[PDB]
Paper text:
Microbial ion-pumping rhodopsins (MRs) are extensively studied retinal-binding membrane proteins. The green-light absorbing proteorhodopsin (GPR) was originally discovered in marine γ-proteobacteria as the first bacterial rhodopsin and as an example of a new type of bacterial phototrophy. The bacterial green-light absorbing proton pump proteorhodopsin (GPR) has emerged as a model protein for MRs and is used here to address these open questions using cryo-electron microscopy (cryo-EM) and molecular dynamics (MD) simulations. GPR possesses an N-terminal signal sequence, akin to numerous membrane proteins, that is hypothesised to guide the correct insertion of the protein into the plasma membrane before subsequent proteolytic removal.
To this end, we expressed the GPR-A18L variant, introducing an alanine to leucine substitution (A18L) known to prevent cleavage of the signal peptide in the blue-light absorbing proteorhodopsin (BPR) when expressed in E. coli. Upon careful examination of the hexameric GPR map, two α-helical densities were identified in the central cavity, challenging the initially assumed C6 symmetry and revealing a C2 symmetry instead. In contrast, two α-helical densities were discovered filling the central cavity of the GPR-A18L hexamer, corresponding to the N-termini of protomers 1 and 4. Accommodation of additional signal peptides in the cavity is restricted due to their tilt of ~30° relative to the membrane normal. If two signal peptides occupy the space that will form the central cavity of the oligomer, this expands the diameter and thus permits the assembly of six protomers. The interfaces between protomers 1 and 4 are mainly formed by hydrophobic interactions where the signal peptides intersect and where they interact with TMH A of the opposing protomer. This includes a hydrogen bond formed between the two serine residues at position 10 and a salt bridge between K3 and D53 on TMH A. In total, these additional interactions, formed by the signal peptides with neighbouring protomers, account for an increased oligomerisation interface area compared to the pentamer of around 1400 Å2 (about 25% more), as calculated by PISA30. Interestingly, protomers 1 and 4 exhibit slight differences compared to the other protomers, likely due to the interaction of their signal peptides in the centre of the hexamer. This conformational change mainly affects the extracellular halves of TMHs E and F, and is also noticeable in the position of the retinal chromophore.
Residue numbers in the entry:
A (entry chain B), C (entry chain F), D (entry chain E), E (entry chain C): 23 to 210, 219 to 250
B (entry chain A), F (entry chain D): 1 to 210, 219 to 250
């Protein structure tokens, strides 16, 4: 690529290599954890692998044409956000008892939010109603994960699990807020911001989950 | 492990064969749905072939069968995507091949769980398989134009309702009576999936005889990933006791 | 492949996909079975894998030329029938003690029968003597596994192994009879029948072996 | 390929598929045997894999030109015969005590025999002296494996090991005799004979070794 | 590549092959170490693998154009320095208890230092302020791992872990100093020095970590 | 295992990349030797990476190091075969790269076995490594034409004799004094290999300064496969005790 002229290709290569490394990382570290946490690593590994695959496709499209195919980004979000938000249910199940409806509501909210976001970007619906519905679904998920069943499950957990849950909640609140900001900016230079946001929300989340899994399983 | 790293590298290099099929954005929902479903099916295949570590020896089959389902789906979906790129027409033949090679395994999942959790004669699996084969044969005859749309659709709906009744008040209820609560909940969820999840197919079919590919994609997504996830959940919940 | 015009391509695709699925199934399910029956599954997996390989080659030939490449079919039979017929010896060794001459005589009979069938197909010898020799070898193997050493070994076995042996004997008697029937029909519309017969004799056989292996091993 | 017109391509495909199947077979069956016999299977798997690789290369050369590149055959023999003849030392070590010089003498004799055979075929030396030296090395190996240190090691062994050793000795005496016969015939229609001889001496040998390994390790 | 004309290609080939060998070595040697140290080897293997990937890309660029693609070098540094510097946190966690802020501050310092180095290289900001900021971050990390939290954690550790920590600290102080020296030389014949430095800092570091991990685990 | 069968299939499909380099029969002994050595090195790499199951935790390193030796040799041999096919000239640079990346591991095998079997300071490994590096540098200078053939050859022979003496009556003898008889026999065999097996290189080198590629191929074959087999034999003999 070019040198000191473009920051898009550098970000693409950096994120692709990081995602491949994290995928290998998480598919190899499944040997350390116990039987309970051999899923909280597999799901994160799948998240990073799917993100890496779609990043390779986006890099190919960028080489073919110098534009931003946000449809690929929405495909990647639609197959990663459900798993990332399910990670909460997975760690709560591997750490304590969960009724099961938390996963259902989590998944439904995430699917509705993305579908509406994709429809708003593609122009099927007006931008404002789609943005409002997506924000409402996001706030509903935050409320469920902050003061609803998620908080109740987090109350009965070991201190390491509680700290990891708080870190993941902060990540959801702050790092995930970049994408709606970019959506509002585009409906009223972004590829690099999305790359960095995916880097954070796809590597730090998995590393937090791996840390808590190793710290819990080490007991034995 | 370094040998396991070879497996990881092979899994990573498999998408490279798929150079990419994208062509238009925000114009056609078929190609987007095809890629979404293909990637989700590959991810679920890897998930189910990896999560066999947790389950005990009794439930190491209930994951492999679902992994096979998703893998066969993924294979036939690539084929379908290739055909669609070559020609923008309905790949009915490939869809019915995929259904014929996947519905038997999905309906055999019932027998597998009812045998690994309790004792069952298994005649429910045989009769449901026969009903599903009849429904699939009638659907292909209708799609091929041999029979009219309305009679074939009515016969398929009647066969599907039969299968639902067999799953609700047939031998399935008796088998579910002597089982753990987790297996009962899994059976109820799978019965609800049969009632509603499979019901996406005929309604979408009625859409095509009165677009269809998107509905079929979404229906395959649901009834091949949610089913496997429910089976995995019940298998893990049962095997953890060990 | 043509759609709604010929069932040969549909049968080819169906039995290719089913054979690949059965290969993966049999090479993955070796974990459940004990150390005794880790061979009764590997050989079945090899049978299905070789069938899938030769089926891909036959599909390529059919696409290249629309005829009947029976040479590849006889190669597939020559490399799959010995393993399917040695499955009897394998399950008998895993269930009881067998001298070993049963496998030798089975292999010799199966190889002689196929070679004679191939020679009859190719026209090296007269069709009727080759057909008679093949039928005689088939009946000799049936007698050996019905009233000879195979039956004697089956007498001293667990009920599950005996039931599997009876089911496999019934499959050998009935399903395998399609191929000599096709040979007689062609030496006195077929590829579909052969495909279905391969599906049956290469998947149901392996599934019976897997079922009996799992039933035997799990007990412990 | 052609149908009922050539028997070379059929033999090539048959042997290649059989060698690939046997390679997979032996690399998978290492899980059944104990720690002692996890080498007697690896070496046979390597033999079949190398033979399969060189058979693929020979098939490619045959497609390129319809002739017999015996240099490839001698390369395959030079990297398979040492391992096959070492299999004796490996099973004797895994079954009883071996001094170690048996391997040395075995390997030296096999290397000398092939090198002289290759030189005679390539015309570096006269055919008769090379044939005489190769036959002398072969007879020396047979004597060592029949009445020398090999027989002494076979005397102190379990009956299964003794039977396997006798079977391997008979294979060495009879099946390996095909190659010098073909060499004499060509230095005074052969590719098919060499294919079949490799089939036997590369599959039956490994199957005998696997049989004795499984029968020994089953004890535990 | 030219022979006896330029040492850049020789260095590229040497450090590519060595990095691949070290990657395989570190991903294979995870079997020996216990469950505590199955992470240090994994991270070292990831470091070497990413280095090998970016080295292959840099070799391709060099063949395509005979210049210095320092952008790829800084991508490699940005994706490898955080892991090498978190190896300290990993070994400290595997040997004793660490709060976790050490890894956070290490990562922040390393990322800030490179980003500033990349900006100085690209000319986004003035070279001297970026060099000063990078040196300040480097000295801050050295102080943290020499007299701060890292030293305090190293005080309560086994003698082997303390010796490994001292060796790694010496490597950080000495071998890593090549890169700022090269930057000063170029901002006030190099690729060979950088290659050798990468060889050292990416192989000797991992070998020290592997040695201490094996020494700790085998005890048990 | 099916996942293991993926590794087996990858190993089987690796030779497919190598389409084939054969050109002439009974005319040149270089290409034949190249193919023989490449295939033997790949086989030994697979053998040493598979046989780690038998050896105990102490000797699971003495096999991995030899496997990498053979793997690096195989990689550089392919490169050398490609260069030779492109141009029929001596690949001196690749040979010295391979030597520089393999001789250190082969000489480190001594330290590895003397540490996994008994206690040794390890200065013998360091001094032998320094001597080998000096010998390789002198050989590279002689081959590049910087120095004359006779002085470089004499210096290399003197360094090699030094290394032999260090292996005979240096720290190696003291380390071998306190060891099991199997380790002593392995050390004697490796010392004999150093004395005679490596001696193929200088004499063949003297052949090139007074073909060479065939001698170097055979020498690499011996000193990289027999060495690994001796290490594997001693490792298995020691670890079986468990
Ligand atoms: C790896 C990718 C991740 C974690 C993506 C997350 C994306 C979101 C949270 C997107 C949210 C949106 C809204 C809340 C409303 C407007 C539309 C979206 C899709 C931009
Ligand atoms: C993986 C694919 C699956 C589970 C496909 C399921 C398909 C059906 C349940 C189709 C049903 C139909 C009827 C009930 C009647 C009308 C015709 C069909 C074939 C569309
Ligand atoms: C997977 C393929 C299988 C099980 C093939 C089986 C084939 C036979 C049993 C063929 C039998 C024949 C005779 C009994 C006589 C006439 C010639 C044959 C080869 C058609
Ligand atoms: C898989 C290949 C095998 C077992 C090849 C074996 C080859 C021989 C035993 C060849 C022997 C020869 C002589 C005894 C003398 C004349 C020359 C040879 C090479 C043909
Ligand atoms: C494998 C690569 C490694 C270990 C790279 C290390 C790089 C550095 C320590 C770079 C340091 C720099 C400074 C301390 C200041 C000036 C800018 C840099 C990036 C050259
Ligand atoms: C895998 C490669 C190996 C073990 C290479 C070994 C090479 C040598 C021992 C080379 C030795 C030389 C001398 C002793 C003096 C003359 C020059 C050399 C480099 C040919």
């Amino acid at each position: 690529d070019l040198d000191a002229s473009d920051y898009t290709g550098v970000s693409f290569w950096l994120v692709t290599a990081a995602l491949l490394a994290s995928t290998v990382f998480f598919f190899v570290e499944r040997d350390r954890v116990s039987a309970k946490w051999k899923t909280s690593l597999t799901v994160s590994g799948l998240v990073t692998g799917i993100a890496f695959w779609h990043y390779m496709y986006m890099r190919g499209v960028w080489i073919e044409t110098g534009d931003s195919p946000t449809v690929f980004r929405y495909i990647d979000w639609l197959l990663t956000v459900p798993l990332l938000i399910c990670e909460f249910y997975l760690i709560l199940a591997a750490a304590t008892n969960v009724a099961g409806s938390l996963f259902k509501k989590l998944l439904v909210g995430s699917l509705v939010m993305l579908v509406f976001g994709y429809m708003g970007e593609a122009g099927i619906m007006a931008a404002w109603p789609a943005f409002i519905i997506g924000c409402l679904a996001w706030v509903y998920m935050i409320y469920e994960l902050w003061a609803g069943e998620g908080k109740s499950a987090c109350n009965t957990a070991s201190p390491a699990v509680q700290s990891a849950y708080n870190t993941m909640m902060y990540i959801i609140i702050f790092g995930w807020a970049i994408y709606p900001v970019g959506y509002f900016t585009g409906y009223l230079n972004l590829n690099l911001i999305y790359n960095l946001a995916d880097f954070v929300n796809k590597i730090l989340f998995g590393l937090i989950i791996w840390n808590v899994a190793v710290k819990e399983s080490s007991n034995a």
